[PDB]
């Protein structure tokens, strides 16, 4: 027989369980939420040891048939630490590679932005927000110039993409940190359980999005340090809010 285990995010693990009911063997796969792109190979108790890029070609009565992509890119469970963002910082995520790219943002003086490579519908995972894992306290206690890329993961953990990893030449394993802010966003941040990055967030569309459209998310500045005017967000956001409210 064959078991499929679906995560809430749409991704799944599929294969024959061993003598103990564990996802362990040489023919197990993680399948991305597109139900087509796969990481196929050696898993131990659901943990990816050596997954090669594959395509889910067909399914017959729950039994999947995969074809390996040409090449030598192998992926493994490689969860970040407080200091290490990735063992392979320049190894892109293959699902992300087909959906998004980094270019100059169409927003003025907003650096780079994240763009859809293709047309997709609502609720589509486009990009992964991986980074080093730090506490809320450390973020709260340090210089604000250090907190451009600090995304809250849960009540306890923040994912950061600090220097020098905020530059694509130094880090391109995930690209979620390139999406800029909008008050009319076309995406949201959502939870994701990634076979390489582990528990992280992703960028998921809210509506249909056309090819080459900039992907944008509403940032969260409710908990910015209070000033005379309320929570004092970074000044670009303050300006854009005043600008947006005028409409």
Ligand X SMILES: C[S@@+](CC[C@H](N)C(=O)[O-])C[C@H]1O[C@@H](n2cnc3c(N)ncnc32)[C@H](O)[C@@H]1O
Ligand Y SMILES: O=C([C@@H](Cc1cccc(C(F)(F)F)c1)NS(=O)(=O)c1cc(F)c2c(c1)CCNC2)N1CCCC1
Report the interface residues with ligand Y, using CB under 6 A. 136, 139-140, 147, 149-152, 158, 219-221, 223-224
Q: Which residue has the tokens 């003598």?
A: 19
Binding-site partner at residue 236 among ligand Y, ligand X, none, CB < 5 to 8 Å by type: ligand X
Q: Which of 7, 101, 219, 221 is catalytic?
A: 219
**Residues facing 135 on adjacent strands:** 157
Residue 22 among known ligand-binding residues:
no
Instruction: Report the distance separating Cα 54 and Cα 145, nearest Å.
Output: 41
> Which one among 49, 110, 193, 206 touches ligand X, defined by CB under 6 A?
110
Q: Do 52 and 66 form a contact (C-beta atoms < 8 A)?
A: no
Residue 211 among known ligand-binding residues:
no
163 preceded by a cis bond (ω within 30 of 0): no
- Alpha carbon distances (Å) from 179 to 114, 201, 227: 5, 13, 27
Two tokens, residue 171: 């880090």
Q: Which of 117, 125, 148 is nearest to 214 (CA)?
A: 117
Least distance (Å) between residue 180 CB and ligand Y: 9
Q: Which is nearer to ligand X, 62 or 220 (CB)?
A: 220
Determine if 218 is a binding residue for ligand X (CB under 6 A): no
Look up residue 137 and give its DSSP letter: H
Instruction: Report the distance separating Cα 115 and Cα 92, nearest Å.
Output: 16
Q: Which of 75, 129, 165, 171 is catalytic?
A: 129
Would you call 95 a catalytic residue per the annotation?
A: no
Site for ligand X in 124-183 (CB under 6 A): 148-149, 166, 177-178, 180-181
Least distance (Å) between residue 149 CB and ligand Y: 5
Residues forming the active site: 129, 177, 181, 189, 219
Binding site for ligand X (CB under 6 A): 105, 107, 110-112, 148-149, 166, 177-178, 180-181, 234, 236, 240
């Amino acid at each position: 027989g064959v078991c499929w285990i679906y995560y809430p995010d749409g991704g799944s693990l599929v294969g024959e369980v061993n003598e103990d009911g564990e996802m362990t063997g040489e023919k197990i796969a993680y399948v991305y939420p597109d139900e087509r792109t796969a990481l196929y190979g050696k898993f131990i108790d659901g943990e990816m040891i050596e997954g090669k890029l594959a395509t889910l070609m067909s399914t017959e009565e729950g039994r999947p048939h995969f074809e390996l992509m040409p090449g030598n890119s192998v992926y493994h469970f490689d969860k970040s630490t407080s200091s290490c963002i990735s063992t392979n910082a320049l190894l892109p995520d293959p699902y992300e590679s087909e959906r998004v790219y980094v270019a100059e943002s169409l927003i003025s003086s907003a650096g780079e932005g994240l763009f859809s490579k293709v047309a997709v519908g609502p609720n589509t995972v486009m990009s992964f927000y991986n980074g080093v894992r730090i506490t809320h306290q450390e973020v709260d206690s340090r210089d604000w110039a250090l907190n451009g890329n600090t995304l809250s993961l849960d009540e306890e953990t923040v994912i950061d993409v600090p220097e020098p990893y905020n530059h694509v030449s130094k880090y391109c394993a995930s690209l979620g940190h390139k999406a800029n802010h909008s008050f009319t966003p076309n995406c949201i941040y959502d939870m994701f359980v990634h076979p390489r990055f582990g528990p992280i967030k992703c960028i998921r569309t809210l509506r249909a999005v056309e090819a080459d459209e900039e992907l944008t998310v509403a940032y969260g500045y409710d908990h910015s340090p209070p000033g005379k005017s309320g929570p004092e967000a970074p000044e670009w956001y303050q300006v854009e809010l005043k600008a947006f409210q005028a409409t």
